[PDB]
Structure formats: C-alpha cells, structure tokens
Amino acid sequence: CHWADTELNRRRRRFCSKVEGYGSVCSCKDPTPIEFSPDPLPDNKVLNVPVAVIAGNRPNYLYRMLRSLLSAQGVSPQMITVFIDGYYEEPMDVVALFGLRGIQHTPISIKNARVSQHYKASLTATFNLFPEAKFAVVLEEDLDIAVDFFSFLSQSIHLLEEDDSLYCISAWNDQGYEHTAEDPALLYRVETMPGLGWVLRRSLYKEELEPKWPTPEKLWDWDMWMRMPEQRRGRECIIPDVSRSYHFGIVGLNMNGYFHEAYFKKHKFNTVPGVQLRNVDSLKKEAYEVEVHRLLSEAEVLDHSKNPCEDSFLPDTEGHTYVAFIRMEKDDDFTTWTQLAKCLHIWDLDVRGNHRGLWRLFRKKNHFLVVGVPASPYSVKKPPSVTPIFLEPP
Numbered sequence: 359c360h361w362a363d364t365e366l367n368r369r370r371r372r373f374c375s376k377v378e379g380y381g382s383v384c385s386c387k388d389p390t391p392i393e394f395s396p397d398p399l400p401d402n403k404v405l406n407v408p409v410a411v412i413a414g415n416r417p418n419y420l421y422r423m424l425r426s427l428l429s430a431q432g433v434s435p436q437m438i439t440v441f442i443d444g445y446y447e448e449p450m451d452v453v454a455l456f457g458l459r460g461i462q463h464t465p466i467s468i469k470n471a472r473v474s475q476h477y478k479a480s481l482t483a484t485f486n487l488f489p490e491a492k493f494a495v496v497l498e499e500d501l502d503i504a505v506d507f508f509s510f511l512s513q514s515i516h517l518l519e520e521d522d523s524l525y526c527i528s529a530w531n532d533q534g535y536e537h538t539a540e541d542p543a544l545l546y547r548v549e550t551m552p553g554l555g556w557v558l559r560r561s562l563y564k565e566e567l568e569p570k571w572p573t574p575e576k577l578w579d580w581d582m583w584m585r586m587p588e589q590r591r592g593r594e595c596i597i598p599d600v601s602r603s604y605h606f607g608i609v610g611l612n613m614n615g616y617f618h619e620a621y622f623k624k625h626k627f628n629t630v631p632g633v634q635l636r637n638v639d640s641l642k643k644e645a646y647e648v649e650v651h652r653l654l655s656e657a658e659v660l661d662h663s664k665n666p667c668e669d670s671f672l673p674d675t676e677g678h679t680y681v682a683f684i685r686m687e688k689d690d691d692f693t694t695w696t697q698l699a700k701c702l703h704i705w706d707l708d709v710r711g712n713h714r715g716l717w718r719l720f721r722k723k724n725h726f727l728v729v730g731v732p733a734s735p736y737s738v739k740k741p742p743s744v745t746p747i748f749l750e751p752p
C-alpha cells in the first residue's frame with residue numbers, strides 16, 4: 359500500500375508484510391487505528407504502577423486484549439510490559455505493532471508447572487524493571503479490560519497500603535453473573551485470591567512468595583497454590599460486585615468450549631465509564647464488620663419454609679435487602695452452599711464468595727445475604743422462628 363508516510367504507518371507496513379489474518383489493519387484504504395485516545399484520569403493514584411501482561415503463543419487473543427487495555431481511561435502505555443512464554447514470532451510482532459515493550463522467556467518444564475515458572479519469572483522481572491514500584495497489576499492475555507479498569511484501581515489502591523489484612527485487589531467477582539450482579543459502585547471482601555486482573559504487593563512477593571515458589575517438577579497451578587492457607591493466611595482480597603474484566607479465551611490449558619459456555623459466558627462485565635466507588639474506606643477490616651452488621655439489621659428475614667431454588671423464594675420486589683440462613687456446622691461445611699449455587703446457576707465447583715460464612719449477591723435486583731449457621735459469627739442474628747435451610751446432593 360501507499361499509506362501516508364508516518365511513523366504509525368511504517369509500523370503498519372512491517373507488520374502487514376509479515377503476518378495475515380487481522381483484517382482491516384492491512385487494508386489499503388480503511389486502515390484501522392493502531393493508536394488510541396483514551397480519556398485522562400484526573401489525580402491518578404495508579405499512574406506509577408507497572409502492568410505485567412502474561413502471554414504465550416496465542417497471538418490473536420493478545421491483539422484482542424491489548425486493544426481494550428489501550429482503550430481504558432488513565433492507562434500509561436510506558437508502564438506496560440508483555441511477557442511472552444517463548445520465542446514465537448507472531449506474538450512479538452503484535453507487541454511491536456502497538457509499540458510496547460516485550461520480554462521473551464525460554465520455557466521451563468511442562469503443562470501447568472510451566473505456566474507457574476513463567477509467572478515467577480515475569481513477577482521477578484517486573485519488580486526489577488521498576489525498583490521503586492510497590493505494586494504491580496497482573497493481566498492475562500485472554501481478558502477484555504473494562505473501560506474503567508484503572509479508575510477502579512485508582513480509587514481502591516490505597517486500601518492495600520493501609521490494611522495489612524488484605525491479600526490483593528481483583529477485578530473479578532466469581533459470583534457476579536448477569537442475573538446476580540447489579541451495582542458497579544459496590545465492593546466486597548472475600549476469603550480467596552480471584553486473579554483474572556489483580557494487584558500484587560511487592561513486599562508480599564519479594565518477602566513471602568518468591569522464596570517458596572514451587573520448583574519446576576511440581577504439577578501445581580500457581581493460583582491454586584496462592585489460595586492455600588500457607589500462602590493466603592487468612593487474608594482477604596477486594597472485589598467489585600460488577601467485574602472489570604472478562605475471560606474470552608476458549609483455547610487454553612484447562613479451557614474448552616463447554617466449560618466456557620457453562621461458567622464464563624454469562625459473567626457480567628461493567629461498561630459504565632468512570633464509576634465513583636461508594637464509601638471505599640468501609641472495606642477496611644474493622645469498618646467492614648460495621649457495614650455487615652448494618653446490612654443485617656436492615657435485611658428482611660425470608661420465609662424458610664419455601665423452596666430456595668425458585669424465584670418465589672423472594673417477594674416480587676426491586677431494591678430491598680433480604681437474608682437467608684443455611685446449615686453450616688463447621689468452618690468447612692459448604693454442602694448446602696454448593697447445592698444452592700448449583701440451582702442458582704452461578705459458580706459451584708469450589709467454594710468462593712464467602713466472608714466469615716457470609717455470601718453477598720443479587721436476586722431479581724434485591725440484595726441477597728446468605729449466612730452459615732452455626733459456623734458464621736453472624737449466626738447470632740437468626741431469629742428463633744428460622745430453621746436453617748439444608749440441601750444435600752443426590
């Protein structure tokens with residue numbers, strides 16, 4: 359082609375001369391913009407946090423994910439680094455087309471152990487690239503990034519700095535499905551590490567995780583290892599009710615077409631720009647227990663003689679707060695919750711969403727609290743008239 363001789367189009371020639379399958383990027387007329395104009399973020403508290411993009415040999419996914427990353431408000435392209443698990447040519451070509459920094463890594467070990475070793479190399483490299491950074495954003499190559507991803511991190515990053523009980527901040531709510539998530543200004547505390555767009559504290563990585571990172575022979579998933587008690591240690595992460603990332607990768611290490619249609623396709627994705635988070639400082643450890651007690655003292659107790667698995671369980675309402683109590687006789691008795699999550703059509707393969715035996719979600723746009731009795735500390739608010747709901751698997 360004869361595109362106008364500028365730096366952006368010279369970058370375009372070298373790419374379009376080498377690879378195929380990207381459509382309007384390579385057309386003569388109608389060239390797709392390969393530079394973006396996201397909106398500015400006034401007073402950006404995240405402006406000096408590096409962003410680590412983890413990638414393998416999935417060049418089409420990476421190009422899709424980078425287009426939404428470069429479109430988010432308040433993004434800093436200079437802070438982005440793409441870490442590729444190997445020396446594949448096409449992924450490096452895609453990084454070059456957008457003009458970002460790329461780092462290649464020779465693969466170590468096999469299967470999930472090799473994903474684990476790549477993560478460890480990338481996290482250690484990020485904190486070597488910026489010796490003064492205190493956090494780092496970790497992003498997978500198969501995620502769409504919400505347009506307010508950095509606005510969300512900018513307003514909440516100060517919680518990691520002030521609350522030592524916090525493990526991380528994540529963009530992903532495991533129980534935020536299209537029919538059970540509603541409020542993009544709302545945040546929770548959860549007893550797990552969700553990943554899928556998360557913030558890592560440098561002191562946590564350099565002083566705790568890196569010295570005991572699993573060696574290459576162990577066929578362990580890095581994220582399941584980080585959820586083990588010996589790593590998390592009772593700490594919690596901050597998540598929003600409406601997720602700020604979306605997992606679109608169908609071809610992956612543990613991913614197939616069926617598992618995606620069943621547990622990811624219906625995940626809710628925030629599209630409202632520049633949301634102001636509501637009362638952020640209440641997510642600190644002791645202030646949050648004040649908030650949960652306030653929520654439980656305004657919630658209407660539901661009729662527990664009715665079927666929990668059907669819509670009739672709640673009055674025909676919008677905007678109310680209802681509470682339900684389920685049987686949980688030890689800190690690990692999740693039998694009823696798992697059956698409840700299955701019939702609610704949310705995540706039910708391993709337990710997530712819990713905070714001291716409490717689950718928070720939405721049902722027909724009412725806030726819906728679930729309390730485990732007798733194990734939860736909040737069991738003290740169950741009236742005598744309620745017999746906790748119990749359901750066992752067939």
Ligand SMILES: O=c1ccn([C@@H]2O[C@H](COP(=O)(O)OP(=O)(O)O)[C@@H](O)[C@H]2O)c(=O)[nH]1
Binds near residue numbers: 473500
């Ligand atoms: O051989 C590999 C396979 C995976 N990945 C990275 O590990 C993450 C997990 O990817 P994948 O979606 O394939 O795992 P899944 O979620 O499907 O189980 C991705 O960001 C990949 O870039 C990698 O670096 N090398």
Ligand SMILES: [Mn+2]
Binds near residue numbers: 498500605607610613
């Ligand atoms: Mn994936």
